[PDB]
Design an enzyme around this catalytic site. Structure first.
Site, mmCIF file in Angstrom:
data_model
loop_
_atom_site.group_PDB
_atom_site.id
_atom_site.type_symbol
_atom_site.label_atom_id
_atom_site.label_comp_id
_atom_site.label_asym_id
_atom_site.label_seq_id
_atom_site.Cartn_x
_atom_site.Cartn_y
_atom_site.Cartn_z
ATOM 1 N N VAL A 269 0.826 -1.202 0.000
ATOM 2 C CA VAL A 269 0.000 0.000 0.000
ATOM 3 C C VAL A 269 0.863 1.257 0.000
ATOM 4 O O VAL A 269 2.015 1.268 0.473
ATOM 5 C CB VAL A 269 -1.065 0.040 1.141
ATOM 6 C CG1 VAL A 269 -2.283 -0.801 0.770
ATOM 7 C CG2 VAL A 269 -0.463 -0.398 2.471
ATOM 8 N N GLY A 270 0.283 2.305 -0.564
ATOM 9 C CA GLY A 270 0.945 3.578 -0.736
ATOM 10 C C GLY A 270 0.086 4.292 -1.750
ATOM 11 O O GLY A 270 -0.990 3.799 -2.105
ATOM 12 N N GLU A 293 -0.307 -9.824 0.540
ATOM 13 C CA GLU A 293 -0.460 -9.744 1.992
ATOM 14 C C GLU A 293 -1.745 -9.013 2.302
ATOM 15 O O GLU A 293 -2.398 -9.290 3.299
ATOM 16 C CB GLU A 293 0.615 -8.884 2.604
ATOM 17 C CG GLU A 293 1.916 -9.515 2.889
ATOM 18 C CD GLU A 293 2.883 -8.468 3.434
ATOM 19 O OE1 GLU A 293 2.811 -7.295 2.986
ATOM 20 O OE2 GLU A 293 3.695 -8.802 4.323
ATOM 21 N N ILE A 363 12.569 2.822 0.292
ATOM 22 C CA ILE A 363 13.192 4.084 0.638
ATOM 23 C C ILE A 363 14.027 4.510 -0.559
ATOM 24 O O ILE A 363 13.663 5.433 -1.284
ATOM 25 C CB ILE A 363 14.129 3.951 1.853
ATOM 26 C CG1 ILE A 363 13.371 3.437 3.085
ATOM 27 C CG2 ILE A 363 14.777 5.283 2.149
ATOM 28 C CD1 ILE A 363 12.115 4.223 3.408
ATOM 29 N N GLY A 387 6.696 -7.845 4.657
ATOM 30 C CA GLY A 387 6.697 -9.047 3.843
ATOM 31 C C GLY A 387 7.372 -8.869 2.496
ATOM 32 O O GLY A 387 7.335 -9.764 1.655
HETATM 33 C C1 LIG Z 1 9.385 1.923 2.299
HETATM 34 C C2 LIG Z 1 8.041 2.676 2.467
HETATM 35 C C3 LIG Z 1 8.072 3.569 3.685
HETATM 36 C C4 LIG Z 1 7.700 3.607 1.262
HETATM 37 O O1 LIG Z 1 6.449 3.463 0.720
HETATM 38 P P1 LIG Z 1 5.585 4.692 0.275
HETATM 39 O O2 LIG Z 1 4.095 4.436 0.498
HETATM 40 O O3 LIG Z 1 5.817 4.985 -1.187
HETATM 41 O O4 LIG Z 1 6.032 5.907 1.164
HETATM 42 P P2 LIG Z 1 6.399 7.322 0.550
HETATM 43 O O5 LIG Z 1 7.484 7.180 -0.529
HETATM 44 O O6 LIG Z 1 5.171 8.013 -0.012
HETATM 45 O O7 LIG Z 1 6.885 8.168 1.808
HETATM 46 C C5 LIG Z 1 7.108 7.513 3.058
HETATM 47 C C6 LIG Z 1 7.974 8.232 4.004
HETATM 48 O O8 LIG Z 1 9.314 7.854 3.797
HETATM 49 C C7 LIG Z 1 10.007 8.970 3.337
HETATM 50 N N1 LIG Z 1 10.981 8.642 2.345
HETATM 51 C C8 LIG Z 1 10.777 8.107 1.131
HETATM 52 N N2 LIG Z 1 11.977 7.975 0.528
HETATM 53 C C9 LIG Z 1 12.947 8.440 1.356
HETATM 54 C C10 LIG Z 1 14.343 8.573 1.283
HETATM 55 N N3 LIG Z 1 15.085 8.122 0.120
HETATM 56 N N4 LIG Z 1 15.023 9.096 2.323
HETATM 57 C C11 LIG Z 1 14.371 9.486 3.420
HETATM 58 N N5 LIG Z 1 13.040 9.380 3.523
HETATM 59 C C12 LIG Z 1 12.303 8.865 2.517
HETATM 60 C C13 LIG Z 1 8.959 9.897 2.800
HETATM 61 O O9 LIG Z 1 9.351 11.233 2.820
HETATM 62 C C14 LIG Z 1 7.880 9.657 3.689
HETATM 63 O O10 LIG Z 1 8.057 10.367 4.908
HETATM 64 P P3 LIG Z 1 6.878 11.250 5.569
HETATM 65 O O11 LIG Z 1 5.854 10.331 6.198
HETATM 66 O O12 LIG Z 1 7.548 12.114 6.629
HETATM 67 O O13 LIG Z 1 6.200 12.129 4.522
HETATM 68 C C15 LIG Z 1 6.985 1.580 2.670
HETATM 69 O O14 LIG Z 1 6.670 0.949 1.455
HETATM 70 C C16 LIG Z 1 7.427 0.492 3.636
HETATM 71 O O15 LIG Z 1 7.689 0.789 4.818
HETATM 72 N N6 LIG Z 1 7.816 -0.814 3.106
HETATM 73 C C17 LIG Z 1 8.214 -1.887 4.012
HETATM 74 C C18 LIG Z 1 7.434 -3.210 4.008
HETATM 75 C C19 LIG Z 1 6.589 -3.515 2.766
HETATM 76 O O16 LIG Z 1 7.033 -3.270 1.661
HETATM 77 N N7 LIG Z 1 5.377 -4.316 2.905
HETATM 78 C C20 LIG Z 1 4.341 -4.392 1.839
HETATM 79 C C21 LIG Z 1 3.292 -3.266 1.765
HETATM 80 S S1 LIG Z 1 2.393 -2.716 3.226
#
Ligand SMILES: CC(C)(COP(=O)(O)OP(=O)(O)OC[C@H]1O[C@@H](n2cnc3c(N)ncnc32)[C@H](O)[C@@H]1OP(=O)(O)O)[C@@H](O)C(=O)NCCC(=O)NCCS
Ligand SMILES: CC(C)(COP(=O)(O)OP(=O)(O)OC[C@H]1O[C@@H](n2cnc3c(N)ncnc32)[C@H](O)[C@@H]1OP(=O)(O)O)[C@@H](O)C(=O)NCCC(=O)NCCS
Ligand SMILES: [Cl-]
Ligand SMILES: [Cl-]
Ligand SMILES: [Cl-]
Ligand SMILES: [Cl-]
Lengths: 504, 504
Positions: A269-270, A293, A363, A387
């Site tokens: 999700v995102g 998941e 990230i 996951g």
């Molecule tokens: C990695 C993850 C955080 C990014 O997904 P996302 O929905 O696209 O999140 P975003 O890119 O929109 O932004 C998330 C946060 O991380 C930050 N971020 C994104 N890229 C970054 C980087 N290169 N450096 C620092 N911070 C970063 C964003 O600024 C944002 O921070 P904020 O809440 O203060 O605004 C997220 O997918 C995750 O935690 N994955 C781990 C487990 C997983 O993949 N499970 C399956 C799905 S639930």
């Protein structure tokens, strides 16, 4: 109508507060909860209060908190404000709990979601004292019907010494039947069973969690809503990423490297992953199958379309407006969906067998396609591996999706060397940003770099990356995976030092 | 007696040199070969000559070389001296081929051994032109009996347009029957089969590789020996490492966290892993079971003892003195051993199901227990990830074994931050050096560090590590996984710069 259909167990109802007193200081507590769905709500609030109280009087009151995945404000939120968790696992998205983890106040370790159960049974987390599980209903013969997620509930019930059930009449009664719980031994003592899932829409077990009734110390009646994070509409960057990926799919189908109905899909999700799903709904592909998941709003829409035949996940993660839609024709959706134990939805054997296409966010990625899923600047926890590692390594195709920059331009999604590694090169094949799509299939590190840099990196950082490569090539200690150790992490330290990655 | 028992195929015998002419420039060539066992020997030498020749006349002559795992001098060695390979995969240990890879002269990508077959079938490596497979014999009905390893042979035979078989009368005829090849679809087009291995000594298929006879373009009679790397006797460091691990086992058995007969064992090769096996032979544990990639001298000894009931692997990797012992009572050993396809011996589903204890070596580990298996200083390839990633993530227990220092003291096996990551924290639980044993079960990064540093690191580096930690704790951009980005990689750059990790 009455939710507790086992007559005798009705005798075990008490109030949240009285139940909370069952949980002692230093207890290891397993709970339901997964992507803000189906976590205990009332008992945790009650436990928070009592913890703040005991703290103000200078006595110790903390628990080890093991979940399925992320919970919500009533649990992770409350217990954190009250400084009540000394150890957490395996995955959190609560802001308050995050800060606690990042301040060293809560010890954290984000295990692979699919492995949590097995490690619990193995004893890694210690003896389990309490299992706290939310339920839609209890059957005539004492079965626990789960709510909006399954997660690790069955394992926690079997491990815990005492059990507390929250029967939440907010949850839709027609969830009953949507779950599939396996009777045997998925993550127990070797040798484990073969769980014979050979098709995403297949049921191999039953609709209820099983537990010795005698372990049920308390049943709390509740009526409180899940964390329903709202629909993050796809922006320009996300729409662009979707476009490149749908092109790639269309092309794989043309080359006969995927069928017209693709393969079983796993998206997170995102707004990112969310957009991809909207892309697919309008796209050319039909007869799709989810083996994920999570079921998010996208999959719901396609299940409605007919665009998706069936979706398998461990939990829902809908928005208010979606949740509302499903509650109506819940009879319909009930027949297109299956919720499984997370150790089954994230089984490496089953993922590999079905050939899942994994689509995960990140990230950052380094130039050689290593992936950072968790630790900003390599030290500051965001959410957890989750996951993504289960699906990335096990999938038929491993795709990562991201915007090329973070923080309105000040961070590059692609870097010289990732500050933390979650997914090694072997575990990542397709990268997509709003710049373009890199296909690393069959490439060596060095060719991986040419692809990622020229296809994925942002114009503002492309040149600096290319420069880092070219010189690293000339000077690296080895030429196979070339690196300038003195400035590998430099782009990060520069953000740490000036709040931007662009230099002077 | 006659090795080619199919009458008609005898009509296809030709000399090595004539067979070699079947392989054109730019051909993708899949071959047998795995841990220096059962790789083609004569055709490769012949191909080398002709490559050196064509080079001296200014014409291009190179192939893509895909194996099972590591081959030997006749293949990897020869083709490398002749600068004949443009792309190699997935795992090499040949000195000459290594230099070629590290010089950028051969493109390399070390896929997980267990996944190579699936990726080949997927098309990642291109269309296969030639399969070149060594054989003990060809059966009456045209079955190919493999030699001292199985590896990826079956997949290569099915994919390749043309096939060349080397029937090597050096190999023992009584190898016939020792192999188990699965008829169905292990790594092919989803949905894949369930391969119902539920017990390490179990056979699920037959003793021969299957191929359309019409694809066999040439059969070469040969008589040449395998690379029989000699027995690296355990030294003081290794004997010490064995001691700590056997203690740990004894203790897990006392706490009833493992049975008296342990679980199925996977060890690599080295003097390290070799010592562990000698430890076990004398130790208190009985009724042991191997479910490994490789059968080395250790397992052979225990198979003799009765200490090990059965061993499953994909290949042998014996020393001259061991090879000799088995060739005698080959009738006996034949019944205690099973050689499988590497995509079966390294199946995540099966490893996890059997609950394997994985014991692998490593270059280095950082303080938070991330592991480097491949790239010295992060850039210079050594061997390749191999099957360590298959077993580490899938195993019941993931153990890494190493001396605390490399290069007579000038390198620390434990560092601030690994230069390259192969196995993330999640995938590593027990570390062992000659200093002590760290048990990271259930710990957060920070507690992982206390363990690794105080238990595993060398006295000479312990202090500097502790210092790196303590200050990182105070200053890290986040406190969850604390890092000093400016000196993370510093210990490495210091070795690059001065040939030692100790400073001034
Ligand atoms: C990695 C993850 C955080 C990014 O997904 P996302 O929905 O696209 O999140 P975003 O890119 O929109 O932004 C998330 C946060 O991380 C930050 N971020 C994104 N890229 C970054 C980087 N290169 N450096 C620092 N911070 C970063 C964003 O600024 C944002 O921070 P904020 O809440 O203060 O605004 C997220 O997918 C995750 O935690 N994955 C781990 C487990 C997983 O993949 N499970 C399956 C799905 S639930
Ligand atoms: C990691 C690996 C290279 C080391 O195993 P090992 O042979 O027991 O380790 P050794 O220390 O005895 O020797 C390995 C070489 O790497 C070097 N080495 C070891 N640690 C090092 C370090 N931290 N930095 C630089 N070099 C190092 C050694 O000096 C030695 O070099 P040399 O022989 O060219 O002089 C090897 O285990 C491997 O490649 N594993 C990958 C795949 C695998 O585990 N599959 C399972 C079955 S084998
Ligand atoms: Cl299974
Ligand atoms: Cl590949
Ligand atoms: Cl299987
Ligand atoms: Cl753990």
């Amino acid at each position: 109508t009455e939710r507790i259909r086992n007559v005798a167990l009705r005798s075990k109802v008490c109030p949240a507060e009285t139940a909370s007193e069952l949980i002692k200081h230093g207890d290891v507590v397993g709970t339901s909860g997964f992507t803000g769905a189906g976590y205990p709500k009332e008992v945790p609030k009650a436990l928070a209060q009592r913890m703040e109280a005991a703290h103000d009087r200078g006595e110790k009151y903390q628990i080890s908190l093991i979940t399925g995945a992320s919970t919500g404000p009533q649990l992770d939120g409350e217990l954190a404000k009250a400084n009540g968790v000394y150890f957490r696992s395996p995955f959190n998205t609560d802001a308050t709990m995050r800060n606690r983890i990042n301040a060293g106040e809560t010890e954290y370790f984000d295990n692979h979601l699919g492995q949590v159960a097995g490690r619990a049974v193995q004893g890694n987390y210690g003896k389990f004292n309490i299992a706290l599980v939310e339920a839609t209903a209890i059957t005539e013969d004492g079965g626990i019907v789960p709510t909006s997620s399954v997660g690790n509930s069955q394992t926690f019930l079997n491990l815990a010494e005492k059990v507390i059930i929250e029967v939440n009449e907010w949850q839709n009664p027609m969830l009953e039947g949507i779950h599939d719980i396996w009777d045997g031994n998925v993550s127990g003592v070797p040798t484990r069973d073969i769980v014979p899932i050979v098709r995403a829409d297949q049921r191999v077990g039953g609709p209820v969690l099983r537990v010795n009734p005698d372990k049920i110390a308390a049943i709390v009646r509740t009526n409180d809503r899940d964390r329903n994070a709202p629909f993050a509409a796809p922006d320009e960057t996300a729409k662009a990423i979707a476009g490149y990926l749908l092109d790639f799919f269309g092309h794989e189908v043309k080359q006969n490297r995927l069928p017209p109905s693709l393969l079983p899909l796993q998206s997170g999700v995102g707004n990112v992953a969310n957009a991809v799903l909207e892309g697919l709904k309008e796209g050319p592909f039909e007869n799709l199958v989810g083996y994920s998941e999570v079921i998010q709003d996208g999959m719901l829409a396609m299940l409605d379309s007919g665009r998706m035949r069936i979706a398998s996940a461990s939990s829902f993660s809908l928005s208010p407006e979606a949740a509302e839609e499903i509650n109506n024709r819940m009879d319909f959706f009930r027949s297109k969906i299956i919720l499984r134990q997370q150790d089954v939805s994230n089984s490496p054997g089953i993922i590999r067998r079905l050939g899942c296409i994994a689509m995960n966010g990140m990230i950052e990625a380094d130039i050689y396609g290593n992936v950072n899923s968790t630790r900003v600047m390599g030290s500051k926890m965001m959410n957890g591996i989750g996951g993504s590692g289960d699906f990335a390594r096990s999938s038929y195709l491993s795709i990562f999706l991201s915007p090329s920059t973070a923080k309105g331009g000040k961070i590059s999604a692609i870097v010289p060397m990732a500050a933390h590694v979650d997914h090694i090169m072997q575990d990542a094949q397709i990268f997509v940003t709003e710049q373009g799509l890199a296909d690393l299939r069959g490439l060596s590190p060095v060719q991986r770099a040419r692809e990622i840099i020229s296809k994925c990196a942002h114009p503002d950082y492309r040149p600096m990356l290319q420069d880092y490569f070219d010189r690293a090539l000339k000077n690296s200690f080895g030429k196979h995976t070339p690196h300038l150790l003195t400035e590998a992490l430099s782009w990060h330290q520069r953000f740490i030092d000036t709040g931007t990655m662009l230099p002077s």
